[PDB]
């Protein structure tokens, strides 16, 4: 997995590759690692895939309830405090590593959370097996006060580093842009540089090829 977060002058962008693996094997060639906690607070995870999704949804559900109750737009510091306190309680057994990013009435925010429940803040971050490839790009090109365009380019490039050099990452680049003024934009398969080439031959079989022992219709209704 390669996930990055990058702050720009008026917002925050996150991005991720689209490959899930069971050890050496590629399960999903185009899964979605970008998760919504609330409309303008988004999330990318690495580690135990079930864990990052569950902890995101639990906290997403409680953040919705908090917002309704308080009549206020959810804050990124709340997602953080709830995630970190939850993860801490489970003493790393919930293997969630997350980059959490958003805009709220207080401004724009970029945070990291580790499975034991420690958090950090910064202007640029990476996580995942591709984390070193992506950080090397970030450390090479990140400047203070980037425009929106530059930030998308830099994040996109960081994910590419992970896609090309980390065997744990591959396929596509997903992006989400959270600007202070606006609605969050989720950009699914913003880059697709790993198209499978056309096969050399068609493997469709002549009908009758398979030997059938017996047969019957299956009843669905009642």
């Amino acid at each position: 997995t390669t996930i990055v977060g990058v702050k720009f002058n008026n917002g925050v962008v996150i991005a991720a590759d689209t490959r899930s693996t069971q050890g050496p094997i590629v399960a999903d060639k185009n899964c979605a690692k970008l998760h919504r906690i609330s409309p303008k607070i988004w999330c990318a995870g690495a580690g135990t895939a079930a864990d990052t999704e569950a902890v995101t949804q639990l906290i997403g559900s409680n953040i919705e309830l908090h917002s309704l109750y308080t009549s206020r737009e959810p804050r990124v510091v709340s997602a953080l405090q709830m995630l970190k306190q939850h993860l801490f309680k489970y003493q790393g057994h919930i293997g969630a590593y997350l980059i959490v990013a958003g805009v709220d009435p207080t401004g724009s925010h970029l945070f990291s959370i580790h499975a034991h429940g420690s958090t950090d803040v910064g202007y640029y971050l990476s996580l995942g097996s591709g984390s070193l490839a992506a950080m090397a790009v970030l450390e090479s090109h990140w400047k203070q006060d980037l425009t929106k365009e530059e930030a998308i380019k830099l994040a996109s490039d960081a994910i590419q580093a992970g896609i090309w050099n980390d065997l744990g990452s591959g396929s596509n680049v997903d992006v989400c842009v959270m600007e202070i003024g606006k609605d969050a934009e989720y950009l699914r398969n913003y880059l697709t540089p790993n198209v499978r080439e056309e096969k050399q031959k068609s493997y469709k079989f002549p009908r009758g090829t398979t030997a059938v022992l017996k047969e019957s219709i299956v009843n669905i209704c009642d």
């Binding site: 306190q85 003493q91 580790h114 034991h116 429940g117 420690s118 958090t119 950090d120 803040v121 910064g122």
Partner: protein, 196 residues
Amino acid sequence: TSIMAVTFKDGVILGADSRTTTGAYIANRVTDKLTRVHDKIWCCRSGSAADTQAIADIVQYHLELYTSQYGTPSTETAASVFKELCYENKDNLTAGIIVAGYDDKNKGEVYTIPLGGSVHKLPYAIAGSGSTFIYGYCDKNFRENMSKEETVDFIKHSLSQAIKWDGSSGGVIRMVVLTAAGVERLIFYPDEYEQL
């Protein structure tokens, strides 16, 4: 990690490097290790980041509740809350905390709570992996009742040595000055402190 707190004439100063590692990888080169638990009570954290953040958060909660009910807590009260948490949970915590604060009556104070959960009141304290390299130096150069600028220098020199030898320490040197004045954040960059 290299962290220290030093008492001086007008108060207390906390300082730290800014590097967090997982193995030999620098996870964060610009960490802020100086943590406020009240207006004029801060700490430096060492050991497990998860553990010390969770503790610092609980302490901050306790000191806010304390302030609502009884008024400004002393630095001793702060230290005692940390100790209670550390001692009582010694079997699932790896936490070493240095607590530093200023008030009007008691002036600048420093307490260190190392791994056991013991508490020690001290004129100055050092801790973190990098601290072992500066025991000799700090003991030779510390004096009571130093001025602000002398104290800033002592920490600056001390931590630059700690950073020089410890691979776990490094980045920028952050400091917080705590006096009647006031709360002041200082930062110092490699290009400066490496030439010391």
